[PDB]
Symmetry: C3
Subunit: 114 residues, 3 copies
């Protein structure tokens, strides 16, 4: 059980860090709470309820990997002094597809539901 | 940041072009089928996930490259692991389509 | 396009999985929890929309942990060149893996508790 607390600390440290620093993460964190509430207050099925919640949760997972990747690029920024931003672009592409995915999910599921 | 990356993947990555095609295909096929929403959503978003992961694998490979590639076993490990992540995504999407359709028939 | 290449990429990927399993212990443990979970998903009498969600939620945990593992491998590569690491990137990666797990836990709960009365 010793490693699990070390890891969860890391995870929490990572999360607390994203929240202070990334404005978009604060927005997505907000989106998860609503997604939860809206999904729970609406009379829908579980398969719908999971997907309304899970699609949005995926946005967060991806903004979190993107933020990790951006953090690496920046460590190199300080030493190389090279501007190539190819990685940060690709990470942002990933986050966009994640968001689109959630939008589609929500449209399709709510459009069915209503 | 966002749009610049996708045009980059399409021009440079063949697999991304292949998955990007699969994404609209999946969408068309998903809408063409008479299924419920949970079904339709899962058909699309599974293929979409493959694309999302492929993009992250692509970012990572790009960072590996920005550092001089030289020779190192932590560079290759990264590209390989990232390469594996895309595979589980593809495997996942493949299973998904099976389960939904074997059922559908 | 060049389709001969698909086996080459598939090599790399397999190399990557073997890599994760040998080196990352957390990959082994979650993989155990995940493989167990997947198997249970196949034996449960649920609908297809339910079954897919049970499997894929858990599979994402694997997919996310694998990207974290790629990420950390890059941090380790920088570690050789530079001296001080913030740990900030590796932390975010650990966060991503957690949110993945929580999602799978939430999925499974919501789907089982709902579906089972
Ligand atoms: C129906 C059942 C619903 C179950 C519930 C679903 C929960 C969603 C999962 C994760 C949320 C992650 C939130 C991330 C918060 C990061 C920490 C943070 O913001 O810290 C504040 C900071 O310390 C100020 O100084
Ligand atoms: C009354 C009609 C029925 C209710 C209809 C919805 C009403 C509230 C809208 C959205 C909730 C949040 C989920 C929206 C899905 C996409 C979320 C997303 O991807 O967010 C990206 C992120 O916030 C970028 O910073
Ligand atoms: C119940 C039903 C069970 C169904 C079981 C299905 C098993 C076979 C699955 C997929 C085929 C193999 C696809 C191999 C693709 C490898 C290419 C790859 O991973 O490319 C990533 C690359 O690194 C670029 O970023
Ligand atoms: C349409 C419904 C499909 C549902 C089932 C599939 C779901 C995954 C989606 C696309 C796989 C795309 C595969 C592209 C080729 C393998 C991946 C790759 O990276 O290949 C590199 C190679 O060099 C390239 O030729
Ligand atoms: C009605 C109540 C139902 C309750 C249902 C609860 C269980 C949910 C199942 C799987 C989630 C986790 C699957 C993905 C793997 C996570 C990895 C993990 O948990 O690792 C622990 C670690 O290995 C320890 O040493
Ligand atoms: C029916 C399914 C069969 C299998 C049953 C398995 C049950 C596991 C459930 C919950 C564990 C949740 C534990 C979450 C611990 C924190 C994870 C974390 O922080 O992971 C980050 C780390 O860096 C990663 O490498
Ligand atoms: Na690649």
């Amino acid at each position: 059980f010793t490693r699990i607390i070390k890891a969860a600390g890391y995870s929490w440290k990572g999360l607390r860090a994203a929240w202070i620093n990334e404005a978009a993460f604060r927005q997505e964190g907000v989106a998860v709470l609503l997604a939860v509430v809206i999904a729970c207050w609406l009379d829908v099925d579980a398969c719908t309820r999971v997907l309304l919640i899970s699609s949005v949760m995926l946005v967060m997972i991806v903004e979190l990997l993107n933020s990790a990747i951006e953090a690496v690029v920046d460590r190199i920024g300080s030493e190389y002094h090279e501007l190539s931003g190819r990685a940060k672009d690709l990470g942002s592409a990933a986050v966009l597809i994640a968001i689109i995915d959630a939008v589609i999910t929500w449209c399709i599921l709510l459009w069915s539901h209503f």
